[PDB]
């Protein structure tokens, strides 16, 4: 047996705690030399870290959609790899495959049925895009806008995006323009990200919530109010945005990342004053869970791919190398170190 590396849950930060690199631990383990019928041996190429993983660090995730990781057991999440050996009828050495529950380990023996083969032509050979813009975050943005945004044919709406330089947000803002908004404004956490948005991703304006006057800048950059809010963050930021939203406007309630490490359920309740405004102005604020639109994954991926290949959709990512950096990458992402999709490259081939 050859020795490979893997990552296990070392400790929990507590439901009110901050995640740190050291909640995870690297181990060296043997990889079995033989696989069974129906199984494949895969080499891991890229792994995703994503905010929802914070929940799997707790004893109770707070939702049936994801289960808690267990102390000292291998952790898992979105991944992409290449088949090294197959005893599954529909997979063959050299196929590129993805799983939602890829164990954080350099080489893995997996049930062939748990994997999906992917076509690298969809991403011009940039396989890591399958974990981001031409993956679940991209679908979340495209489907969320389609289903919850109500961007009418021929209209000239203003869209605001929170978490605007992250995975979902950076795509959402571009899609807002693609699909007919005349104004797209992003809110994000650094001046570097503001520049990215307006100089590369085509946002009409960007606001740094840590340093700028958010209400003031939204009044300046959204002179006709806000019709569509793609909300990744919640909290104080969303209160400020909602206060400037128009009658019959729409909140795409993607995530509420500002309410993490507090024991706060989703959808989190708007404060009394902000709920009053929401209701007065008939602002819609429904649950949105991308998995409820599985039937749109095919056209969604096909559209994301097309826009990318056309040079319209600009795909940003921040890649860190080495499985030993999974914990660091997750912590970094949670605290805003990522521009676009946070990726960890496990083998650079
Ligand atoms: N509804 C769905 O089906 C669905 C699907 C996928 C993801 N999501 C959710 O959508 C959200 C975005 O996920 P993502 O994958 O696109 O992550 P991401 O935006 O790429 O990364 C998270 C970012 O959140 C920002 N942030 C962190 N703490 C914050 C705070 N307290 N206040 C404001 N901003 C903060 C940081 O950027 P700054 O530098 O700008 O602070 C960080 O880079 C998360 O809530 C995620 O769980 C929902
Ligand atoms: C996991 C995510 C979100 C992504 O991270 C990687 C790509 C992918 C795994 C993706 C894929 O790779 C191939 C197909 C196929 C494309 C197509 C056109 C075909 O090739 O027949 C039609 C059938 C089929 C199954 C539709 C569904 C998708 C788009 C499928 C599985 C949706 C889920 C998707
Ligand atoms: C496909 C699976 C099963 C998983 O394989 C990948 C992540 C994910 C796509 C996952 C996600 O990515 C982000 C969230 C959010 C996390 C959280 C805490 C927030 O961020 O506000 C609360 C709101 C919200 C939408 C709850 C639902 C989940 C857990 C959501 C969509 C459930 C479905 C889930």
From Swiss-Prot:
Location of this chain's protein in the cell: Cytoplasm
Tissue spec: Widely expressed.
Enzyme kind, highest EC tier: oxidoreductase
Listed Pfam families: ADH_N_2 (PF16884), ADH_zinc_N (PF00107)
Cellular-component GO terms for this entry: cytoplasm
Binding site for NADP(+): 166-169, 193, 209, 232, 254-260, 288-290, 338
Enzyme Commission number(s) of this protein: 1.3.1.48
GO biological process: prostaglandin metabolic process
InterPro entries reported in the protein's UniProt record: ADH-like_C, ADH_N_2, GroES-like_sf, MDR_fam, NAD(P)-bd_dom_sf, PTGR2
Catalytic activity entry: 13,14-dihydro-15-oxo-prostaglandin E2 + NAD(+) = 15-oxoprostaglandin E2 + NADH + H(+); 13,14-dihydro-15-oxo-prostaglandin E2 + NADP(+) = 15-oxoprostaglandin E2 + NADPH + H(+); 13,14-dihydro-15-oxo-PGF2alpha + NADP(+) = 15-oxoprostaglandin F2alpha + NADPH + H(+); 13,14-dihydro-15-oxo-prostaglandin E1 + NADP(+) = 15-oxoprostaglandin E1 + NADPH + H(+)
Keywords annotated in UniProt: Cytoplasm, Lipid metabolism, NADP, Oxidoreductase
Any one Gene Ontology molecular-function term assigned to this protein's record: 15-oxoprostaglandin 13-oxidase [NAD(P)+] activity
Ligand binding (substrate): 100-101, 289-291
Matches recorded under Gene3D superfamilies: Medium-chain alcohol dehydrogenases, catalytic domain, NAD(P)-binding Rossmann-like Domain
Record family assignment: Belongs to the NADP-dependent oxidoreductase L4BD family.
Function: Functions as 15-oxo-prostaglandin 13-reductase and acts on 15-keto-PGE1, 15-keto-PGE2, 15-keto-PGE1-alpha and 15-keto-PGE2-alpha with highest activity towards 15-keto-PGE2. Overexpression represses transcriptional activity of PPARG and inhibits adipocyte differentiation.
Assembly and interaction partners: Monomer.
Identification of the protein by name: Prostaglandin reductase 2
